[PDB]
Design an enzyme around this catalytic site. Structure first.
Site, PDB file in Angstrom:
ATOM      1  N   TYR C  70       1.279  -0.894   0.540  1.00 46.54           N
ATOM      2  CA  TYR C  70       0.071   0.143   0.142  1.00 46.54           C
ATOM      3  C   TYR C  70       0.813   0.793   0.078  1.00 46.54           C
ATOM      4  CZ  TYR C  70      -3.870   2.910   0.930  1.00 46.54           C
ATOM      5  OH  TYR C  70      -5.002   3.997   0.898  1.00 46.54           O
ATOM      6  N   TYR C 289       6.800  52.354  31.072  1.00 53.32           N
ATOM      7  CA  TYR C 289       7.081  51.139  31.268  1.00 53.32           C
ATOM      8  C   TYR C 289       7.933  50.468  29.286  1.00 53.32           C
ATOM      9  CZ  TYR C 289       5.290  49.819  35.825  1.00 53.32           C
ATOM     10  OH  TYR C 289       4.905  49.357  36.853  1.00 53.32           O
ATOM     11  N   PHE C 338       3.425  13.650   7.342  1.00 53.40           N
ATOM     12  CA  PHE C 338       3.284  14.868   5.871  1.00 53.40           C
ATOM     13  C   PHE C 338       2.593  15.821   6.391  1.00 53.40           C
ATOM     14  CE2 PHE C 338       1.077  11.068   4.337  1.00 53.40           C
ATOM     15  CZ  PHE C 338       0.306  11.301   5.192  1.00 53.40           C
TER      16      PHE C 338
END
Lengths: 624, 625, 626
Positions: C70, C289, C338
């Protein structure tokens, strides 16, 4: 005007004694909210009973005749009692859902027996409601899981716990027993009729929309109060500006604001302020005030339109199949798909974030001396600022509130999963979205509570400012004479007394480095130059040293006297009288023991429980 | 491996008796969570007493000298102005005590200038279970968690308006609460107001219990992928170490390693192999992505949660107020250690990772509910046999969509919403506490999702074992009836193959229904066996059918009733099955079992929430190295 | 230090000539960006060839004896169904060529079963500047970047419908492109379709250039915090090692270490110290800040960008197709390499950190534009002197809000939007390419913000140097005039204090206007001295002092300014930046008398950031830091 519609909403909410559930009379979001919040409000189901029984019969005979029409009752309920108690939908929401479920049946499309409807009515009037897990609904074949708990109560499932009032929790069959009801044995289509509706999402969305209208009108109104305290130019609300950019919400909010500000005694102070040193002060206000009508426009329109949409849903048959008994057919559709409510809940949450940002920008301006046109930093009275940080804590919290609110306003409807064996490959997520909009309204209430508190503080500071400049003017005026200074000098000296913002030197008025003494010192030198002498110097040195004999003491005196007027002529008097007298507060300072929490908690609670509508309606008396 | 680090965190959470607070011993997230969740755990503040007093003295001498150092009645006007929250809701006792611990620890480095006495008071309030009632909102976590921390300071100074809890029952004003545990309200000295309120202790506190839970639940999700493989009939090859050797994300390698080990010689993997050997061309050759790509999916989630734990623990073990007192070199150092940004950004990332764990669970659950995707399992995991009155886990399925949808929405960032705050002084601010709260809410949902998934996989374990026993009964009845009716050897083999091949859940509801797959399969063979070979053959084949519908259903029913009244015994996941079924007292779900899905899943959820789930987890994982 | 690591990245980007593709030597993000952006850089595939062929032949063996495996035992029907994109926008040639490199590299592990000849064709297409035109959208990056990678395969097999670019203008059908570079269309063998289409090369390509830029811009932003400290009159104490030692996030320690070093011998910190010693009690004791908490802010950003870099490189150097051919043991292994999730999630995180970088820049720029917050500087950094016709950098200020806002919007996650895809087979999918693309758009904006910020700070250096010069002129004029009018020592010292103390930009527009702060302060002191020394004679001399002041003072302020238009930066570690922007790019102090628009000045800075030139003054600035 939407202003009158919202007033009508508030009036109806306050007034209603009975909700007429009849299949013809519309239920509004004020009614839903009144049922939820005022327990003396009762449901009155009117014997529509004819079409309910016809429908019920049609379904019940198609079962005895053993016809086959798609859409056993307990097995549906059993598989749907699938929530988990981590948190829960509140009793107000569950009772609201019961009402909407009850109402849905009146159109005679659902096939439920009339007696079940009678049972719903009785449970509502008896304050019995099941305890319902918070999550589990995607609002598509309806609010299946949460509505399953109401059906679970009706059939007396022992695992379903029911509230009776605020204190009693009993298993379902005992709750039914205590109200003279017996468990139902469900008939054909009845399981589906009870579970497959939009009633929970639509319940939350109703209290959310009622709240959205009230808070909207409140924020719009308080833009006028802001103008008054910030020394705004009321001309931003002039009808022509808005006639040539005619968004209905822009016209209508400007309309209210023009009216609130028309004969304003603070607007009179504002004018006198921009007349002094005219060409050294801003010609226009900053955007948080000046573009408020343009800002409000889409928010008014969104909140009004969403109200229509939610009320249509309140007054719908929203199960499936829809029984067309007249034509002998069961109709297969998907009225349980809550997408109308879901989408509008996302939109309103965005509008609410926009209202929050308007409040945050206004509050920010009010805290900063550079932007507040004479007011002290943090709205601190002092006079000793080293031990008085004023509303700095509330300022920080307003950023905290806005930040979370903007985060909340991301959409829920964009997160559609393909659900229930891919059968529900679109689903509205209406209940989830409504919950988030509700959460967003909670934060907006905090921001309103804070903003109104800060403006009452500013009213006090503006009234104290006017009286303090008068003391200074009198002290300078009389000392000038007593030292035998010329009229040139006296008037120059008095201009300074008028022009220098008092909060810049209140801390130590006779400090030679602070703006009062600085202005007088430059005026004294210009006098010496304009009149040239040794005698003039003697009297001017005398004037300066004799400033610290009296000035401070008299400024302190008029202050302490204020601690222990223009607002009386202002349309916002009811708000100020409510916060100061009715709620029992005062000008914030190091000498007042109450924390900001204690003060703001009182205002917040009044917003929460609807008491704030009293000063609001008062304020708007006569507006047409 | 992160697997052993998490196991180390769980062991530490269970074992610790006393948390050592000394300025040198690290507090981990497991320590914070134990203090919060197990009251037997006490605080041990060690006499670091030297360095604290030195610093305290420096500060005090510098003020008593009348020296002008910035940030060093002035203190009480600070507390007053910060007692500015509103009760709508509240930060819970667990967060507040967690913060109190973190606030105490930060002082131990001797940079803060607080008195030792105040610290001893913090220790005692902790061990005496006393904590202030704290409003939920108001902090932007930038000059610190100023508002909520002010309530701790308010308690210490006996502010009457600050309400305090003693245990779960008692609530009294701060002065009375100090009295009841033998303490007096403090009169705060130079820098003490600022040391108390200007810290990152609340956000870091929520973030500690958040990170502890994220670790445990991550390991739980990874492990349960192995359970999913077993019940879904997966191909364990997805975990082969060679695949991940060539794509070497550490989280990919480590999750694959754990999974290979859990699935090696699985008795369920043996059924899986059998299954794909029958009708091979008609069945998928690879699993779907929610199983097959699980290690690739888990990799960033593992790494995010591990890296975030490190960052949060660094914050736990920090001086996070301002100015930082360098008493040794005679300067107050002006910085911004109260800026909670490290925690804030990582809470956003962890919320995205938690959303990713939720999506993995959702996708797996979805496959399991759908007959087309579940490789023999009935839709909704309904046992039936009568499906008209058994909708199985359909309610749980809908709820999983609901859970995931709200989870994904929660995972938007908070740190992107920085407002210019506090007269534009705080023009950047971390919003760490808000972010921590949202990630905490996201984990609440993940727990619901894990509970449902586990319940569903236990259902599927039961259905898989029942399946095996049912098919063997069908084979035995078919065999013994083929003999009885005197059927040809060809006919017998052909009929026995059908009994083996047809998924039994496709005909359980009425096994002898001619329109259902068993009878369809037998009827095809019967026509085939007639072609390969007469009137008496037809005779015996009609007798077969006849006697099938006398015996088959009853023996199927009997073996099912027996099951209701095994391969899991050799599975690494037996502890989980045994826990849910035995300890929690549940059984295979069906119309005959009265308990609702709520009742079953609730038991599982509570065991996740209270920590009992770690026991079967540790057992399951024994020997993995 | 991450600083050295980023300096290593830039050096590699600059000095690399050949990329060694061999299956053992790691390709870094610098190498990928080098290849994409510097066409003189060539791929050198180094015969690795032996394992490729072993794998290739194994696959072809099974095809011969008809084994049945396969995924391996057709290709043109796979390619055909995947050529399913639409041109609306396209993936740029730079992304496509980077994807081609990564796909080539993935094959070098010998796990893919692709023919060596196909690999050599990839190298050749790369070195000859051929790439397919690739539609922008279609990938969910799960069974790979299937649709976009299909266009690479479509080029290789010579699909006529596949349009290929050769260099910047030339566009030809795929057969023609292959023929122009001496290749012939391939006939794909078993498993070659999959080898080509089923990988993570596109998302990881965009992510590689994304990570190289993230690293560079990060260091740049960190460095420019010091420049911000210099021009804003900050206190460098915020960067002190003990502050960060007791809160030891690695990025907090290292950013502050860099900043302490950049500011240690600063001639601007000297002006700053002098500034705070005058009227000490009326001026803020701490910075706001955006400066003071910049190390704490940068910490998670540094750490995100570095860990994300590692992850993206791990993916560059991976076999990411399926099945994984284990020829050694006569098996194909079936997994899902993948699945682009490692890159997808880290792209989401880096986008948030980039938004945090932009917010830091926005807050700094904001302070700089506002006189209340800028410690002496004029509003909008307007030189004037006539401010009624000089609105300075107000346009750029507005633009910075627009930039920051869109940037924060982009930083929402992509990975939370996973749909159940491909017949519900891909029920989880990484969305990596989509996320990478959004992080790239975020970086485009950050580049805009950095360009503006650096331009503003160069303006500020100029204003600061002019300020020092102007105050000196004022002191001198006041000192000399006091003498010429025979003023007492008491008067002279009060008047000279005012000259030193009053911020010059508050009165520059009209130095002798009696309602502006210079004259106000002078009048005040004059009254004080008339009282202290108490006379008709003094008044005479003070009036003559005033009249002589309005004859001479302004003329001498104009002269020094006009001269400046036609020094402390010379001692500053930021000289390279300032010199780069003023001389190298040819710009000057901004005003109504300078013709170039803010657009023309900022374009120049942005272009230098976008094409890499900005790394020269950056590397110059950091010389010595170890």
């Amino acid at each position: 005007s939407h202003v009158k519609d919202i007033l009508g909403l508030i009036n109806a909410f306050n007034e209603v004694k009975k909700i007429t559930v009849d299949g013809t009379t519309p239920i509004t979001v004020a009614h839903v909210a009144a049922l939820a919040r005022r327990h003396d409000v009762k449901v009155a189901l009117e014997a529509c009973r004819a079409r309910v029984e016809t429908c019920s019969s049609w379904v019940q005979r198609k079962a005895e005749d053993g016809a086959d029409i798609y859409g056993l009752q307990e097995s549906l309920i059993r598989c749907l009692l699938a929530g988990v108690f981590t948190d829960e939908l509140p009793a107000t929401a569950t009772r609201s859902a019961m009402l909407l479920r009850l109402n849905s049946f009146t159109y005679g499309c659902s096939g439920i027996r009339w007696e079940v409807m009678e049972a719903l009515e009785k449970l509502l009037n008896s304050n019995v409601s099941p305890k319902v897990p918070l999550r589990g609904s995607v609002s598509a074949s309806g609010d299946l899981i949460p509505l399953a708990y109401i059906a679970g109560l009706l059939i007396g499932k022992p695992s379903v716990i029911a509230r009776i009032g605020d204190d009693v929790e009993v298993p379902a069959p005992e709750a039914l027993s205590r109200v003279g009801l017996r468990p139902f044995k469900l008939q054909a289509k009845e399981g589906l009729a009870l579970v497959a509706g939009t009633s929970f999402a639509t319940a939350v969305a109703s209290t959310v929309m009622y709240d959205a209208n009230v808070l909207l009108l409140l924020v719009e109104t308080l833009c006028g109060m802001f103008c008054e305290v910030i020394f705004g130019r009321e001309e931003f609300a002039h009808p022509l500006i808005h006639k040539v950019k005619p968004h209905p919400g822009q016209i209508e909010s400007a309309e209210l604001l023009e009216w609130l500000l028309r004969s304003s005694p603070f607007q009179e102070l504002s004018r006198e302020y921009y007349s002094i040193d005219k060409l050294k002060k801003p010609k226009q206000d900053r955007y948080a005030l000046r573009s408020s009508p343009q800002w409000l426009a889409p928010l008014v329109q969104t909140i009004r339109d969403a109200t229509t949409t939610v009320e249509t849903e309140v007054n719908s048959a929203n199960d499936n199949p829809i029984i067309d008994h007249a034509n002998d057919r069961a109709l297969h559709g998907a009225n349980f798909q809550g997408s109308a409510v879901g989408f509008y809940m996302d939109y309103v949450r965005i509008a609410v974030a926009g209202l929050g940002k308007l409040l945050f920008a206004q509050f920010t301006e009010l805290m900063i001396e550079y932007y507040s046109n004479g007011l002290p930093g943090n709205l601190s009275l002092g006079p000793d600022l080293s031990v008085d940080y004023g509303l700095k804590g509330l300022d920080i919290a307003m950023a905290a509130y806005s930040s979370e609110l903007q985060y909340l306003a991301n959409p829920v409807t964009t997160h559609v999963h393909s659900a229930e064996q891919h059968n529900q490959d679109i689903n509205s997520l209406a209940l989830i979205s409504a919950r988030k909009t509700e959460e967003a309204l909670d934060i907006l209430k905090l921001m309103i509570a804070s903003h109104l508190t800060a403006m009452c503080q500013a009213v006090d500071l503006r009234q104290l400012e006017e009286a303090l400049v008068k003391v200074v003017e009198n002290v300078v005026s009389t000392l000038a004479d007593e030292c035998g200074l010329p009229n040139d000098t006296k008037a120059r000296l008095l201009y300074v007394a008028k022009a220098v913002p008092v909060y810049t030197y209140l801390e130590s008025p006779c400090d030679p480095t602070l703006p009062l003494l600085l202005g007088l010192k430059q005026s004294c030198f210009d006098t010496i130059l304009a009149l040239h002498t040794d005698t003039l110097v003697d009297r001017l040195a005398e004037f300066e040293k004799r400033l610290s004999d009296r000035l401070e003491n008299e400024m302190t005196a008029v202050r302490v006297l204020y601690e222990k007027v223009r607002i009386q002529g202002s349309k916002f008097l009811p708000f100020y009288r409510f916060v100061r007298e009715e709620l029992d507060t005062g000008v914030m300072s190091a000498r007042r023991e109450q924390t900001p929490q204690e003060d703001v908690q009182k205002v917040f609670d009044a917003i929460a429980d609807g008491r704030i509508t009293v000063p609001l309606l008062h304020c708007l008396q006569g507006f047409l």
